[PDB]
Design a protein around this nucleic acid. Structure first.
Ligand SMILES: [Mg+2]
Ligand SMILES: [Mg+2]
Ligand SMILES: [Mg+2]
Ligand SMILES: [Mg+2]
Ligand SMILES: [Mg+2]
Ligand SMILES: [Mg+2]
Ligand SMILES: [Mg+2]
Ligand SMILES: [Mg+2]
Ligand SMILES: [Mg+2]
Ligand SMILES: [Mg+2]
Ligand SMILES: [Mg+2]
Ligand SMILES: [Mg+2]
Ligand SMILES: [Mg+2]
Ligand SMILES: [Mg+2]
Ligand SMILES: [Mg+2]
Ligand SMILES: [Mg+2]
Ligand SMILES: [Mg+2]
Ligand SMILES: [Mg+2]
Ligand SMILES: [Mg+2]
Ligand SMILES: [Mg+2]
Ligand SMILES: [Zn+2]
Lengths: 178, 119, 57, 134, 177, 74
RNA sequence: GUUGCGUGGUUCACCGCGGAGGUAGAGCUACUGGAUGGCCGAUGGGUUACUGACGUCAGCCAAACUCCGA
RNA sequence: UGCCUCCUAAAAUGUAACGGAGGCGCCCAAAGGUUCCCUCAACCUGGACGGCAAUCAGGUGGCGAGUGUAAAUGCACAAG
RNA sequence: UUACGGCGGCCACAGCGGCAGGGAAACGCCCGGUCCCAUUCCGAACCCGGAAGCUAAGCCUGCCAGCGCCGAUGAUACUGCCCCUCCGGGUGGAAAAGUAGGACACCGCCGAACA
């Protein structure tokens, strides 16, 4: 039983009926998935992402990722169709709540010269997306046993209908805004 | 939404296997309908759209059967097998309904092959 | 596929230099992830030319 | 006037029969040249009939050409026997049926405008008349 | 107040209509308000008189073999060469109904500097009742700078008249040179 | 000179048995490219989309959800 | 085409019925192209009276255009 | 100069010219057989390197994508 | 008989969108991943076991013509066969576009509550 999930349905779940006037308890927003991908564009050359971009997201998120292939060829990017260019992991259920705790508690203040996250990064429906620096911040990968550094970007997908309905939800979970 | 996705996705899986499987007057079609609480089944005769026999888990005989939902699928599978033979049917074609053959539906189908129907 | 391809993800205790500690589930072997900065001992979680001419004179 | 692309470089001749059904009333201006018989009005015959409208009213008003030469016609070389392929395109042509309105015009003076369109009718290989807005 | 004595057609077709235009008269139909359409003959030259001198919105008072009937004129079919009416589309009006009708827009005024005045549309559609109050819509132009254009919005329309087309149709436009 | 002039043979496509016409079992009804018509009751498709007959009867045409079909009333 | 032997209205004409089309015409904010005048202005050109993409209001064109259709 | 698709070809089929445009002398051991499952392109909003356009996330989108290969007829029920 | 579940006919006069309302059984979301089974990663989907929560969504019923669809009559274009020198005329067919208007579907069988 992860601590962020039980803290959600103890006081976060009740507080959103006061900030927003819902008439039914099924309308209360809830984060449904957290999607993480590297997006390794330097894999159209050198063919080394199995050792470096799969062995680290397995350690960060818990489960092995999916290798994503290119949909169309681009001549300017030195790319084909069906070429491994992206590496995605999807987090559901109870491993989502443990990743959102472990991101906001011990990970996210290890960004070099960290000052916050911006609250204008909503897509219009209530789904936040930020990005990170490198194979730093997460302790589960070590800095000594790795290849070249590479960053990622993290989606957070809610059931909220609008923007600030998802801003009030992630402020309560523990995303630092400004 | 996911409740509107599941209706549209299973009646598209249901139309795909319907192009090739229709069923006639002497070989009717056993149509299953699987919800979370019960299953319904009926023999449809796709030439004038006329159900000749039907059985369901919402009637009083299937409701008082102990066990899980597969055992209540076996009981309703035995009812429409012995109601098809009261109308002169002994061979049918099996309509998946868009679902996956396995679990409760394969327990309905295998309990209807033991009791007379020859699909 | 949820069998013997995923790495080891067992329960884990994390301590901090401040004294805050909690228990989650991570991939670190031994359950001994140790941080030096956390969500309570970090800043931002807890907080002209005219004035320099006057300071010279 | 010449189209910058056409799909089919060598076409048949457009067919000269029937009364026109589109572009039969004056839509933009107040005075208009209406055709009364068939021809292939070319692009040279339009450029010659527009600069004879402009240098009679000399300023003011507006000249519309709601006719465009987008139908090619070909020509074999000169001292040539019949039939070694269809020739290369030479002319550009609009298909003009009776009833069709070729040039339109607004101008304040009813006399100079009706007499400027007459100097353009004598540049056209048709019999044409000047109709007004009702 | 436009009396016009009509009559009901005996036989109807391509042949019987060519024997009516050469015999002076002109064919038309009277429909609308759920009734079945009558197939009737207009006097030709007399109906052409009440169109040049009362616009295309003259409320006619047809005399269908003794019986009296009021009628507007929905559409015409001008022959492209003879420029004569071939066919009228008359519709009934029972003394006040909000009908959809287009009506002309005229231009009054001048322009001071070198300014060309080109008006695009000759008519806008309105809604109005029976016997014809509405007529052309006088528009004043003082000839401003060519960043000012006149629209169907801000039009001078009387009471009982409501604009139905669009409040953004460019009706009068002024430019340089 | 020209670069044109070659064509192919004419393949004699089209409806070979019209509506109401009594056919035998096995008769080629609508020879075509693709499915301009679709097969219905007692009509099988064929390799090059030939739409033959499976049982003797009379040809009748109809509509079955946008696709126009050939059937045989036995 | 003629002629010998078979078949006998099966040929053809008209009337009624059951059927497939994409010509003529027309239409195109229904597609692929061509293209006229307004309006809005991404870009390009020297801070802009030159270029005017895409859009939109009207009027149009087509043997290898077709939502239609004798 | 043989073969394949269109227009000419006059709404069944067929139809000439040193008439108008284009393809072929292959390719695939899966791009075949079968059983199940899925919906595309384009546009818009948010995102480390990342740009008009790589991978992600969400809206919109009924066929404008796709079809080993030319064109026509087909194909969203998919033949993708 | 019905503010009800299925299976078909039919494939826009039936679609899209907007505004209200409905939970007896049923369809549903929904709580879980020990068991068959499952994800090119994920109990999201598929499958299984449940009945704490609720009509917010789906679905069902009612109401609007905004967009989309249907659409005559009459006229016109074109046309068969004639008359005739072209132009046109006689006779038999007759569109497309637009207009008046239609339209927020209609019917068959089984089950459940009724009756
Ligand atoms: Mg036209
Ligand atoms: Mg060649
Ligand atoms: Mg051919
Ligand atoms: Mg073959
Ligand atoms: Mg007939
Ligand atoms: Mg016909
Ligand atoms: Mg064709
Ligand atoms: Mg034509
Ligand atoms: Mg176009
Ligand atoms: Mg333009
Ligand atoms: Mg055509
Ligand atoms: Mg032919
Ligand atoms: Mg023919
Ligand atoms: Mg295969
Ligand atoms: Mg396939
Ligand atoms: Mg209930
Ligand atoms: Mg679940
Ligand atoms: Mg509700
Ligand atoms: Mg008619
Ligand atoms: Mg129509
Ligand atoms: Zn600390």
């Amino acid at each position: 039983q992860p601590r962020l999930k039980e803290r959600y349905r103890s006081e976060i779940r009740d507080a959103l009926r006061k900030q927003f006037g819902y008439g039914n308890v099924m309308q209360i927003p809830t984060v449904t998935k957290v999607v993480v991908n590297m997006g390794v564009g330097e894999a159209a050359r050198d063919a080394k992402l199995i050792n470096g971009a799969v062995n680290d997201l397995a350690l960060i998120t818990g489960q092995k990722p999916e290798v994503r292939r290119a949909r169309k060829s681009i001549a300017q990017f030195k790319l084909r169709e069906g070429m491994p260019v992206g590496v995605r992991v999807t987090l559901r259920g109870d491993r989502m709540w443990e990743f959102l705790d472990r991101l906001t508690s011990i990970a996210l203040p290890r960004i070099r010269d960290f000052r916050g996250l911006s609250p204008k990064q909503f897509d219009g429906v209530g789904n936040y997306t930020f990005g990170l620096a490198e194979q730093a911040v997460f302790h589960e990968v070590d800095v000594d046993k790795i290849d070249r550094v590479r960053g990622m970007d993290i989606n957070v997908v809610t059931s909220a209908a609008t923007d600030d309905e998802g801003r009030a939800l992630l402020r309560a979970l523990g995303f630092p805004f400004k | 939404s996911v409740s509107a996705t599941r209706r549209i996705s299973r009646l598209r899986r249901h139309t795909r296997l319907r192009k090739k499987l229709s069923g006639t007057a002497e070989r009717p079609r056993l149509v299953v309908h699987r919800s979370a609480r019960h299953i319904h089944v009926q023999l449809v005769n796709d030439l004038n759209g006329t159900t000749v026999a039907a059985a369901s888990s919402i009637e009083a005989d299937v409701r008082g059967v102990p066990g899980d939902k597969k055992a209540r699928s076996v009981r309703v599978g035995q009812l429409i097998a012995e109601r098809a033979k009261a109308a002169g049917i002994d061979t049918v074609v099996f309509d998946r309904g868009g679902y996956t053959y396995g679990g409760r539906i394969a327990a309905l189908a295998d309990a209807a092959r033991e009791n007379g129907l020859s699909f | 596929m949820k069998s013997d391809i995923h790495p080891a993800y067992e329960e884990t205790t994390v301590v901090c230099g401040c004294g805050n500690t909690f228990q989650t589930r991570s991939t670190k072997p031994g359950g001994r992830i140790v941080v030096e900065v956390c969500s309570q001992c970090h800043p931002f979680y807890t907080g002209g030319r005219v004035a320099r001419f006057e300071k010279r004179y | 006037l010449i189209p910058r692309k056409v799909k089919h470089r060598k076409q048949h001749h457009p067919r000269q029969r029937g009364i026109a059904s589109g572009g039969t009333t004056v839509n933009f201006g107040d005075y208009g040249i209406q055709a009364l018989e068939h021809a292939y009005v070319t692009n040279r015959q339009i450029e010659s009939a527009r600069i004879a409208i402009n240098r009679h009213i000399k300023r003011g008003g507006k000249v519309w050409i709601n006719i465009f030469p987008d139908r090619p016609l070909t020509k074999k070389p000169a001292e040539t026997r019949m039939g070694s392929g269809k020739g290369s395109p030479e002319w550009w042509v609009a298909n003009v049926k009776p009833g069709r309105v070729l040039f339109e015009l607004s101008y304040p003076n009813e006399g100079v405008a009706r007499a400027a369109l007459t100097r353009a009718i004598h540049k056209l290989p048709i019999k044409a008349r000047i109709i007004t807005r009702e | 107040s436009n009396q016009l004595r009509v009559t009901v057609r005996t036989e109807t077709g391509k042949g019987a209509s060519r024997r009516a235009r050469r015999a002076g008269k002109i064919p038309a139909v009277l429909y609308g308000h759920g009734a079945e359409p009558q197939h009737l003959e207009l006097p030709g030259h007399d109906y052409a008189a009440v169109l040049r001198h009362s616009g295309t919105n003259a409320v006619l008072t047809l005399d269908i073999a003794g019986k009296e009937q009021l009628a507007l004129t929905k559409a015409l079919h001008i022959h492209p060469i003879r420029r004569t009416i071939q066919h009228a589309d008359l519709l009934v009006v029972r003394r006040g109904e909000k009908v959809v009708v287009e009506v002309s827009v005229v231009v009054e005024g001048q322009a001071g500097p070198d300014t060309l005045v080109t008006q695009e549309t000759n008519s806008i559609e309105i809604e109005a009742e029976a016997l014809s109050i509405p007529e052309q819509l006088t528009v004043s132009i003082e000839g401003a700078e060519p960043g000012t254009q006149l629209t169907a919005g801000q039009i001078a329309l009387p009471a009982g008249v409501s604009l139905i087309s669009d409040p953004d149709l460019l009706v009068v436009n002024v430019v340089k040179a | 000179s020209s670069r044109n002039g070659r064509d192919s043979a004419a393949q004699r496509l089209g409806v070979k048995r019209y509506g109401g016409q009594v056919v035998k079992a096995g008769e080629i009804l609508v020879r075509q490219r693709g499915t301009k018509f679709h097969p219905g009751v007692n009509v099988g498709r064929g390799g090059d989309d030939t739409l033959f007959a499976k049982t003797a009867g009379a040809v009748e045409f109809g509509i079955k959800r946008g696709r126009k079909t050939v059937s045989i009333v036995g």
